[PDB]
From a paper:
Protein Phosphatase 1 (PP1; 37.5 kDa) is the most widely expressed and abundant PPP. PP1 requires two metal ions at its active site for folding and activity (M1 and M2; coordinated by three and four residues, respectively), as they activate a water molecule to facilitate phosphate hydrolysis from substrates. Two of the most evolutionarily ancient regulators of PP1 that participate in these processes are suppressor-of-Dis2-number 2 (SDS22; PPP1R7) and Inhibtor-3 (126 aa; I3; PPP1R11 also referred to as YPI1, HCGV, IPP3, or TCTEX5). As is typical for most PP1 regulators, SDS22 and I3 form two distinct heterodimeric complexes with PP1 (SDS22:PP1 and I3:PP1) and, when bound, each potently inhibits PP1 activity.
Here we report the crystal structure of the SDS22:PP1:I3 (SPI) complex, expressed in mammalian cells. The SPI complex (SDS2256-360, PP1α7-300 and I327-68) was co-expressed in Expi293F cells and purified to homogeneity. After extensive efforts, diffraction-quality crystals were obtained, and the structure was determined to a resolution of 3.2 Å. Interpretable electron density was observed for SDS22 residues 79 to 360, PP1 residues 7 to 300, and I3 residues 37 to 60 and a single metal, M2, at the PP1 active site. Overlaying the structures of SDS22 from the SDS22:PP1 and the SPI complexes showed that SDS22 does not change conformation when I3 is bound (root mean square deviation, RMSD, 0.34 Å). Similarly, overlaying the structures of I3 from the I3:PP1 and SPI complexes showed that the conformation of I3 is largely similar in the presence and absence of SDS22 when bound to PP1 (RMSD, 0.49 Å). Overlaying the structures of PP1 from the SPI and either the I3:PP1 (RMSD, 0.97 Å) or SDS22:PP1 (RMSD, 0.47 Å) complexes showed that PP1 adopts the SDS22-bound conformation in the SPI complex, in which PP1 residue Tyr134 unwinds to bind SDS22. Interpretable electron density was observed for I3 residues 39 to 60; this differs from the I3:PP1 complex, in which well-ordered electron density was observed for I3 residues 27 to 31 (SILK motif, 28LITK31) and 38 to 62 (RVxF, 40RVEW43 and CCC, 60CCC62). Second, residues 39 to 60 bind essentially identically between the two structures (I3:PP1 and SPI complexes). However, as observed in the I3:PP1 structure, Lys59I3 is well-ordered, binding a deep, acidic pocket on PP1 that is formed by residues Asp208PP1, Asp210PP1, Asn219PP1 and Asp220PP1. Previously, we showed that I3 (FL and I327-68) binds PP1α7-330 with a KD of ∼10 nM and does so with biphasic binding kinetics with the slower phase reflecting the binding of the CCC motif to the PP1 active site.
Residue numbers in the entry:
A (entry chain B): 79 to 360
B (entry chain C): 37 to 60
C (entry chain A): 5 to 300
Write the structure that this text describes.
C-alpha cells in the first residue's frame, strides 16, 4: 500500500501497474524526466516527486484520490495538469521556474500551497482557495501584497525574501496567526488592524525606523525585528499590551549600541524570556 | 625551519586536464 | 540546559549503511540545544581560526548526509582525525538536519579537534537558499530555522593552517588588505550582499578574468590567478584552500596549485556526476587527496 523508491536512480516511470492498492508512492531523487505510466494507480492519495527533472505537469488527471502532491526541485515553468485533483490538501512546488500563479482554481479543499523559491511577480488566482491555512511564497519577486481577501481561514503567511515595500492588503486575514515578512523593503509597521490573533510577527531585515501600530496585537508571543533601524527605546511601549510576549529579536538595530540594551529590553518587556539568541528567564 | 606545503606523489594536477566546474 | 550528546550521536550514527534518504527523529529541544551549545563554542573561539596540522579538510556537503558518513569512515570518525569543514552543510534532499546536527554534535564533543567554517548556505535569510528553511518547517516549525540562523550567525569565517594554508568557503575579496579586517568582524552577524564577509563566502576564481571580474552568481566577484599570486605573497602563504564550486574530481587546482577547490558532495543534484574529495594534511604540512566516488 506504501511504496518508497527514494534515491533509486530510476529514470522513467515504468511498470507500476502491478500495484493494486498503492496509497503512497515516493519517487524522490530518481532523475525522472517525465510523468507517465501512472494512470493505473487509481488508489493513490500521495505522490512525491521531490528533486527530479520533470519539466511539465501532466498525466496526473487519473489520480483523483490524490491528497498530497509534491513536485519540488524540478524544472517546472508553469502550473497545469492539477485541475482534476480536487481533493488535494497540500501541494508543494518548491524551487522550480514558475512565473505566474494559475490553474489552481479547482483545488477548493487545498489547505497548504507552497510556492517558495520561484519567479512569481504578483499574487493572483487564489481567490478560489477558501480552505487555505498556510500560504508560502517566500523567495519570489512579488512587489505588492494583494488578492488575499478570500483566504479567511489562512493562519500562516510566509512572504520573506521578496520585493515588498509596504504592509497592506491583510485586512481580511482575520485568522492570521503567523506573519513572516523578513528581508523586504518595508519602512513602516502598519496595516495590521484586523489581525488580532497574531502570535508571531516577523519584519526583521527591513528598513523600519519605529515600532508602531501593534499595541492591539495582545497575543504576540514572538516579535522578530533584528536588522532594522530602530533608535528609540520609547517605541517598546507599543508591546506592553502583549502580556504573553516571550521572544524578541532586536539585535543589529541601533538600539543594541546602548550599553544598557539588555537592561532596557527587560524593563520595557517584563514578559520576555528570550532576547535575540539567548534566554533571559528560566 | 619554516613549514612548506608539498603534495604527495599520487596526487594529480588536474588544472589543465579539462575538468568540469560549475557554480552549484 | 542538559543534553545527552552520546544519545544524539548514537541515533545519528545508527542510520549508517542504510540506503540514503533514511531519517533520524531527534526531539525539538535536542536540535535547539545543539544549536545553542555549539553557538557558545563558536563565540568562544576566534572568527579567524588558527589551526595546526595534521587535519582533514572537507568541502561542501549540501546536506548529503550519507556522503558525510562515508567521509568519516574513509577519513576516520572524530576524534581519530581533526576536521575542518569549509561550509555548505545544508541544502535540500530532506537530510540537511542530520548533516548539520551530527557536525554540531561533534563540534560540541570535540571543540578543539573539529572545526566548521561558514558557507553561503549558512545564511540568515532565504534570499538565495530555500531547501534548509523548507526542511525545518516541514519537519518541525519555522522558529527552529530561526534558531539555526542564530547558530549560523556565530560561525567562524576563515582559517589559516600553520601560517601557510588560507581556508574559506568562497574566496578572496578586493577589500581584504589585512587579516585584522577578518578578526574585527563581530558576531552574531548576517551575510551582507556587499563587502568582505560576502566575498569571503561567495567569490570564485576564474581562468578568464584578469584580476577582478563580475560573478555570474549575481553576488560578489571573481578573481583570477594573479589575484591569488599577489594574495599569497603579501601574506606569506603557500595555498588557498576553498570550496563552493562543484568540480569533477572533488578537487581541482588553480593558478599552478596555488589554489585548490574542494567539493565533498558526490553527484550533486545527480546531473553533474562529480566525485567527492577530502584533503588530508599531515604534521609536515604535506597534502594528499582521498576521493569519494559517487555511490550512484
Ligand atoms: Fe556555496
Amino acid at each position: 500500500e506504501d511504496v518508497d523508491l527514494n534515491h533509486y536512480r530510476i529514470g522513467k516511470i515504468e511498470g507500476f501497474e502491478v500495484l493494486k492498492k498503492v496509497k503512497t508512492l515516493c519517487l524522490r531523487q530518481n532523475l525522472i524526466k517525465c510523468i507517465e505510466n501512472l494512470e493505473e494507480l487509481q488508489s493513490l492519495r500521495e505522490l512525491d516527486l521531490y528533486d527530479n527533472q520533470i519539466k511539465k505537469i501532466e498525466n496526473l488527471e487519473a489520480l483523483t484520490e490524490l491528497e498530497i502532491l509534491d513536485i519540488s526541485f524540478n524544472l517546472l515553468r508553469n502550473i497545469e495538469g492539477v485541475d482534476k485533483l480536487t481533493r488535494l490538501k497540500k501541494l508543494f512546488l518548491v524551487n522550480n521556474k514558475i512565473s505566474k500563479i494559475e490553474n489552481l482554481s479547482n483545488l477548493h479543499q487545498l489547505q497548504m500551497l507552497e510556492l517558495g523559491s520561484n519567479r512569481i511577480r504578483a499574487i493572483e488566482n487564489i481567490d478560489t482557495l477558501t480552505n487555505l491555512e498556510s500560504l508560502f511564497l517566500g523567495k519570489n519577486k512579488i512587489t505588492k501584497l494583494q488578492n488575499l481577501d478570500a483566504l479567511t481561514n489562512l493562519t500562516v503567511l510566509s512572504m520573506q525574501s521578496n520585493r515588498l515595500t509596504k504592509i497592506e492588503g491583510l485586512q481580511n486575514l482575520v485568522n492570521l496567526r503567523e506573519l513572516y515578512l523578513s528581508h523586504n523593503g518595508i519602512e513602516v509597521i502598519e496595516g495590521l488592524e484586523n489581525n488580532n490573533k497574531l502570535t508571531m510577527l516577523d519584519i526583521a531585515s527591513n528598513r523600519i525606523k519605529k515600532i508602531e501600530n501593534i499595541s492591539h496585537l495582545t497575543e504576540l508571543q514572538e516579535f522578530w525585528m533584528n536588522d532594522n533601524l530602530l533608535e528609540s527605546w520609547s517605541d517598546l511601549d507599543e508591546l506592553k499590551g502583549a502580556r504573553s510576549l516571550e521572544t524578541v529579536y532586536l539585535e543589529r538595530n541601533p538600539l543594541q549600541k546602548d550599553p544598557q540594551y539588555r537592561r532596557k529590553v527587560m524593563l520595557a518587556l517584563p514578559s520576555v524570556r528570550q532576547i535575540d539568541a539567548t534566554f533571559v528567564r528560566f | 625551519p619554516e613549514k612548506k606545503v608539498e603534495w604527495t606523489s599520487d596526487t594529480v594536477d588536474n588544472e589543465h586536464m579539462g575538468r568540469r566546474s560549475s557554480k552549484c | 540546559g542538559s543534553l545527552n550528546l552520546d544519545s544524539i550521536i548514537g541515533r545519528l550514527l545508527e542510520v549508517q549503511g542504510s540506503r540514503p534518504g533514511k531519517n533520524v527523529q531527534l526531539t525539538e529541544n535536542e536540535i535547539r540545544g545543539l544549536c545553542l551549545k555549539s553557538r557558545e563554542i563558536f563565540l568562544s573561539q576566534p572568527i579567524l581560526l588558527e589551526l595546526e596540522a595534521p587535519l582533514k579538510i572537507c568541502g561542501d556537503i549540501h546536506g548529503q548526509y550519507y556522503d558525510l558518513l562515508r567521509l568519516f569512515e574513509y577519513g576516520g570518525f572524530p576524534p581519530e582525525s581533526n576536521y575542518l569543514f569549509l561550509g555548505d552543510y545544508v541544502d535540500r534532499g530532506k537530510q540537511s538536519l542530520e548533516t548539520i546536527c551530527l557536525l554540531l554534535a561533534y563540534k560540541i564533543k570535540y571543540p578543539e579537534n573539529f572545526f566548521l567554517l561558514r558557507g553561503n548556505h549558512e545564511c540568515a535569510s532565504i534570499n538565495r537558499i530555500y531547501g534548509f528553511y523548507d526542511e525545518c518547517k516541514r519537519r518541525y516549525n519555522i522558529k527552529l530555522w530561526k534558531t539555526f540562523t542564530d547558530c549560523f550567525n556565530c560561525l567562524p569565517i576563515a582559517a589559516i593552517v600553520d601560517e601557510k594554508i588560507f581556508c574559506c568557503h568562497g574566496g578572496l575579496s578586493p577589500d581584504l588588505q589585512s587579516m585584522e579586517q577578518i578578526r574585527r568582524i563581530m558576531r552574531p552577524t548576517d551575510v551582507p550582499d556587499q563587502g568582505l564577509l560576502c566575498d569571503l563566502l561567495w567569490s570564485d576564481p576564474d581562468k578568464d578574468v584578469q584580476g577582478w571580474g563580475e560573478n555570474d552568481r549575481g553576488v560578489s566577484f571573481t578573481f583570477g590567478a594573479e589575484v591569488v599570486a599577489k594574495f599569497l605573497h603579501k601574506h606569506d602563504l603557500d595555498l588557498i584552500c576553498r570550496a563552493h564550486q562543484v568540480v569533477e574530481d572533488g578537487y581541482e587546482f588553480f593558478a599552478k596549485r596555488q589554489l585548490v577547490t574542494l567539493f565533498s558532495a558526490p553527484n550533486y543534484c545527480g546531473e553533474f556526476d562529480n566525485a567527492g574529495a577530502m584533503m588530508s594534511v599531515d604534521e609536515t604540512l604535506m597534502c594528499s587527496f582521498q576521493i569519494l566516488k559517487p555511490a550512484d
